[PDB]
Amino acid sequence: MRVLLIHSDYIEYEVKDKALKNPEPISEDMKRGRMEEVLVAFISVEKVDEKNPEEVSLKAIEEISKVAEQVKAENVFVYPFAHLSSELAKPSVAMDILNRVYQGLKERGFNVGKAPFGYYMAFKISCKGHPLAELSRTIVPEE
Amino acid sequence: MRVLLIHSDYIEYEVKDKALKNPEPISEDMKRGRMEEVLVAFISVEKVDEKNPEEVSLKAIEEISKVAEQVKAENVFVYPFAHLSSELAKPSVAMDILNRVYQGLKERGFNVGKAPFGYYMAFKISCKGHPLAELSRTIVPE
Ligand SMILES: C[C@@H](O)[C@H](N)C(=O)N[C@H]1[C@@H](O)[C@H](n2cnc3c(N)ncnc32)O[C@@H]1CO
Ligand SMILES: C[C@@H](O)[C@H](N)C(=O)N[C@H]1[C@@H](O)[C@H](n2cnc3c(N)ncnc32)O[C@@H]1CO
């Protein structure tokens, strides 16, 4: 898994078209979304993650949570970003892992948001630019 | 080298303060910048790249140019983004390679911009979200 964490003033997205044959079912009002003062977690689930979805998810939840705590981010946004890597995990498994990460962060007490899975999506973000506002994390199963 | 390419409506940046002991000298006007209808290339120069700066730079220029052509972009913006990777190359090497890429892209005839090297920087971007608007490349020398 490849994770790019961006502490932002906001994140705004706009669904433009389906990127998969069978994307995540959503309704019309979810075709646009936004979250303020948020740590955006751009995530690409990698093929190697299929080996152990649960372990990767738990570790992702831990790493993302640690950064949020550091920057005082109360809001976290899980953003499907497949092209952060080249070896992509299957969409069914990717979706599964992203759901687990979302569920895990919510359990940790954060106000978590997410963008629909399986779409071509436009987005606007404003990075605060502080010392820990831009961080990347590579998370893989215990090999 | 790690490269994140974002085809955007715009890229806007604001220098905060230095993140390295000796950053790229800058004038007041260089503290802020903006470019529109642009392919933004967030680049992280990695340790492995120190083995062959020219090679990595040449490949980066080629890859970036091919994408810009693919997405029909005439403007390209080189954005030093160290944290795209975990294994960073020396700053002196990172700066030289970033400068090589910037110039290589200009040589291709593109309208190219670049953000100052060595600073904590805030930025605003608007990704077009169309196909090919988000791509990444890992470039490693011989
Ligand atoms: C396209 C771009 O603008 C948009 N932002 C996008 O990335 N869309 C992705 C994710 O929503 C999801 N998806 C599929 N596979 C994966 C994966 N391995 N990891 C993460 N997401 C995936 O399916 C879409 C196409 O890959
Ligand atoms: C900090 C964040 O907001 C900002 N965006 C930033 O990344 N600043 C980086 C680059 O400008 C440059 N820099 C140092 N090493 C490298 C490297 N290996 N690759 C690219 N740039 C580097 O030095 C700064 C601190 O690492």
Numbering used by the authors:
A (entry chain A): 1 to 143
B (entry chain B): 1 to 142
Per the authors:
We have been interested in a D-aminoacyl-tRNA deacylase (DTD) fold that is present across the domains of life in two different functional contexts: as an N-terminal editing domain (NTD) of archaeal ThrRS, which specifically removes non-cognate L-serine mischarged on tRNAThr, and as a freestanding ‘chiral proofreading' enzyme, which removes D-amino acids from tRNAs in bacteria and eukaryotes. Both share a striking structural and mechanistic similarity highlighting a common ancestry. Here we show, with the help of structural, biochemical and biophysical studies from three distant organisms, that the substrate specificity in this domain is determined by a differential remodelling of the catalytic centre at the RNA–protein interface rather than just the presence or absence of catalytic water as previously proposed.
On the other hand, the Lys to Met mutant, although showed partial activity against L-Ser-(Ec)tRNAThr in our earlier work, in subsequent studies with not only PabNTD K121M but also the corresponding K116M and K122M mutants of ApNTD and MjNTD with multiple batches of protein showed a severely compromised activity, suggesting a crucial role of this residue in enzyme function. We solved the crystal structure of K121M mutant of PabNTD and K116M mutant of ApNTD with L-Ser3AA and L-Thr3AA to investigate the structural basis of the observed loss of activity. A significant repositioning of the crucial catalytic water was observed upon mutation of the polar Lys side chain to the non-polar Met side chain, which is present in DTD. This provides a clear structural basis for the loss of function in this mutant, despite its high binding affinity for the substrate. Therefore, we show that Lys plays a crucial role in positioning the water molecule for catalysis rather than acting as a nucleophile.
